mmCIF file of C-alpha atoms (C1' of nucleotides) in Angstrom:
data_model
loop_
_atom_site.group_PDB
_atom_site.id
_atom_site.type_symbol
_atom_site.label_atom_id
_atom_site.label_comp_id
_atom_site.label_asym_id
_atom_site.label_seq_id
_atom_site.Cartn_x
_atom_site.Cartn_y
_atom_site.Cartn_z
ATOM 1 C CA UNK A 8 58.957 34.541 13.158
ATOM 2 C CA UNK A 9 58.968 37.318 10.612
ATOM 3 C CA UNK A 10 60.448 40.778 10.987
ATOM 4 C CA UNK A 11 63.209 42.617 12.698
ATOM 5 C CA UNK A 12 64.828 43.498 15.921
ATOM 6 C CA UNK A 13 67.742 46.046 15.813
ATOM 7 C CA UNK A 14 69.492 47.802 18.242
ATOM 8 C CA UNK A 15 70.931 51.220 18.587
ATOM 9 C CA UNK A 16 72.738 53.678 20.993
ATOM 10 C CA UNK A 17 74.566 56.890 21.019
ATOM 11 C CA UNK A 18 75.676 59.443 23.116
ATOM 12 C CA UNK A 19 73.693 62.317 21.866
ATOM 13 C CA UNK A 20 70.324 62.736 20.053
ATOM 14 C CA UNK A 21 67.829 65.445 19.320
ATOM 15 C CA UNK A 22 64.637 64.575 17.680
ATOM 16 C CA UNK A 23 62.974 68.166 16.903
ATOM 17 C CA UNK A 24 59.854 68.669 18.496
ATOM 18 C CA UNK A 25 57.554 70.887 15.543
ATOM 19 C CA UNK A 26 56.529 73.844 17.438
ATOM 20 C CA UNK A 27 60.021 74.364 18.957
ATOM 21 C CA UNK A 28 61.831 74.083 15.284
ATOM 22 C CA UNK A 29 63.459 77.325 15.445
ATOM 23 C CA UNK A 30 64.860 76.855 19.592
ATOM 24 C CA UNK A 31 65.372 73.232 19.536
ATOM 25 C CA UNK A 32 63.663 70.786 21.908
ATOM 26 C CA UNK A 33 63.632 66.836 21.629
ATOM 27 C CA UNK A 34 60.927 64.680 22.278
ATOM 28 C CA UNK A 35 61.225 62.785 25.049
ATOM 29 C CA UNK A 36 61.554 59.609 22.974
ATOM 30 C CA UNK A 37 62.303 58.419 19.097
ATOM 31 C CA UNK A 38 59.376 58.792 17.256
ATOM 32 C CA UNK A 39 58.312 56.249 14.613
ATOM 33 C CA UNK A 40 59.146 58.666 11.466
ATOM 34 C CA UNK A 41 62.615 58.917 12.473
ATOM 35 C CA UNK A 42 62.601 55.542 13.141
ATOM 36 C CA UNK A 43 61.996 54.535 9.215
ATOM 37 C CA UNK A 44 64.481 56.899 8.022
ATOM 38 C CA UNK A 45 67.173 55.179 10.107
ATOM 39 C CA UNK A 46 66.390 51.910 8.577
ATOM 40 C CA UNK A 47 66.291 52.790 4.572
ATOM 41 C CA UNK A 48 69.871 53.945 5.750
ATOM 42 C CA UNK A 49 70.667 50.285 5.642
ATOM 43 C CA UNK A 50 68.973 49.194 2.664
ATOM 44 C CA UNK A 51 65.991 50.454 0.235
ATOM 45 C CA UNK A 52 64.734 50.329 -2.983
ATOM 46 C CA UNK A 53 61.270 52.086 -4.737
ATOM 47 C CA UNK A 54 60.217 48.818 -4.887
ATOM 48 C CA UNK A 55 59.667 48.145 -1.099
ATOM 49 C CA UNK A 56 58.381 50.083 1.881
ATOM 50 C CA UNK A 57 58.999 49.783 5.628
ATOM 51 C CA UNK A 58 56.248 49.490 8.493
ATOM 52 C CA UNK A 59 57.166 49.649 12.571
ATOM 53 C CA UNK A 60 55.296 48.170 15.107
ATOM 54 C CA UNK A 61 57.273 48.236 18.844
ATOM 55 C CA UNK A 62 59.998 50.516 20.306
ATOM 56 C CA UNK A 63 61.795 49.584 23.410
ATOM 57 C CA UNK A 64 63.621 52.157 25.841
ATOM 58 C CA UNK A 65 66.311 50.664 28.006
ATOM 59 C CA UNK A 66 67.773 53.424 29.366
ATOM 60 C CA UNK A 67 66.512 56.865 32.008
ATOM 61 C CA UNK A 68 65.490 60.193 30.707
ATOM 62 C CA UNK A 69 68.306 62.825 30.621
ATOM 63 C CA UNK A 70 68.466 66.622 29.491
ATOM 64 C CA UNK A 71 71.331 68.918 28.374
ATOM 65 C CA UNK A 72 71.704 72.689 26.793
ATOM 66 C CA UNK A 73 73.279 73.171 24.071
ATOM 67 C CA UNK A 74 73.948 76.869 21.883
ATOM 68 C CA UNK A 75 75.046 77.563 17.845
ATOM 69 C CA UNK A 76 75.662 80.243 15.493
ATOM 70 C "C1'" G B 1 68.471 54.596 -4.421
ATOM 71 C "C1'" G B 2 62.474 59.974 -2.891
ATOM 72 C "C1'" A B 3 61.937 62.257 1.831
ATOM 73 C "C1'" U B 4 65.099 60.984 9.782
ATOM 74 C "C1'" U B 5 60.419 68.850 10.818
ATOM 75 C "C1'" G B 6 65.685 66.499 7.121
ATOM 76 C "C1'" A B 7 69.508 68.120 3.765
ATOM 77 C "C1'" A B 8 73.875 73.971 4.632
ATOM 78 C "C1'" A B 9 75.251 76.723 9.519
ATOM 79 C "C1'" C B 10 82.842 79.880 13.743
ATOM 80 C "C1'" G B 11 81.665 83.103 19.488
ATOM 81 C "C1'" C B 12 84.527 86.221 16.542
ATOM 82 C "C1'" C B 13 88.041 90.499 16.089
ATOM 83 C "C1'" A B 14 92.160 92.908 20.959
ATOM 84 C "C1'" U B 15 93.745 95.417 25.942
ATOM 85 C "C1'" G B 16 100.975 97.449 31.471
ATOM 86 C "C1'" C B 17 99.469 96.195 37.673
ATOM 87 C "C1'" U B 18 101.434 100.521 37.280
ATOM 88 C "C1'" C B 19 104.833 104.932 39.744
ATOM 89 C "C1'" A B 20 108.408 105.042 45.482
ATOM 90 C "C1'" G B 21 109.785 104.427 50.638
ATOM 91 C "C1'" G B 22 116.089 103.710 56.678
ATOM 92 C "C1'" C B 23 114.614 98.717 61.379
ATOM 93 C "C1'" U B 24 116.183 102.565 63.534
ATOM 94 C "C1'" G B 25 118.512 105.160 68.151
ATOM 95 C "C1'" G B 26 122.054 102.132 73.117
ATOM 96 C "C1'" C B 27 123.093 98.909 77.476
ATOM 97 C "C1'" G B 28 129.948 95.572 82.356
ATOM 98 C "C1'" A B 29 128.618 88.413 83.298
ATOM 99 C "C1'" G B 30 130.308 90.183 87.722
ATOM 100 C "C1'" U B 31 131.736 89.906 93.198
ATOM 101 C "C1'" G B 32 135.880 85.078 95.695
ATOM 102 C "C1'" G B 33 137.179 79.745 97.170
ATOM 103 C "C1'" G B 34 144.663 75.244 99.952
ATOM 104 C "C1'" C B 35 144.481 68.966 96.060
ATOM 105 C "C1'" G B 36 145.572 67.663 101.448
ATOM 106 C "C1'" C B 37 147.396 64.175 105.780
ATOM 107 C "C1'" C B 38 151.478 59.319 105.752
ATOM 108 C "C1'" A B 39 153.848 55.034 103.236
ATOM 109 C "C1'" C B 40 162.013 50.620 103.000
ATOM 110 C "C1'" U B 41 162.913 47.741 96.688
ATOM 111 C "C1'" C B 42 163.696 44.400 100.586
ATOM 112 C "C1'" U B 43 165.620 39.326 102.614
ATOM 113 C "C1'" C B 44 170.861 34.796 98.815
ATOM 114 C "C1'" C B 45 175.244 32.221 96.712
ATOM 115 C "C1'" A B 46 184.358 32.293 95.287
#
RNA sequence: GGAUUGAAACGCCAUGCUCAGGCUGGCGAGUGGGCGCCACUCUCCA
């Protein structure tokens, strides 16, 4: 009809939750913000914007620790 | 061709398992036992 479906998968992700900015924690799923940014990775011009609507999780809820300097 | 609470972000530098000590002293394989009794190379052709 009108619109998009994409699809995309990885083996790692982190999507910052803002309180725990300076220890990290994800959300427990993508939220829509990230969401645009992915897709104006494709294409994008001032001229246009981008709206979401639906997200779709496939896959089971999994955790793992991670340390930096 | 503005913006994914994003764009940048080493676990890093280095440290002997070391010095030394006997498997040793010594003990019989040894006493003695029948290979014996008896048996045709023998019957022919100048």
């Amino acid at each position: 009809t009108y619109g998009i479906r994409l699809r995309v998968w990885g083996d790692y992700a982190c999507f910052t939750r803002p309180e725990m900015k300076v220890e990290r924690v994800s959300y427990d799923v993508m939220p829509p913000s990230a969401a645009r940014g992915i897709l104006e990775a494709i294409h994008w011009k001032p001229a246009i914007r981008w709206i979401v609507d639906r997200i779709h999780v496939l896959r089971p809820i999994v955790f793992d620790n991670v340390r930096r300097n």
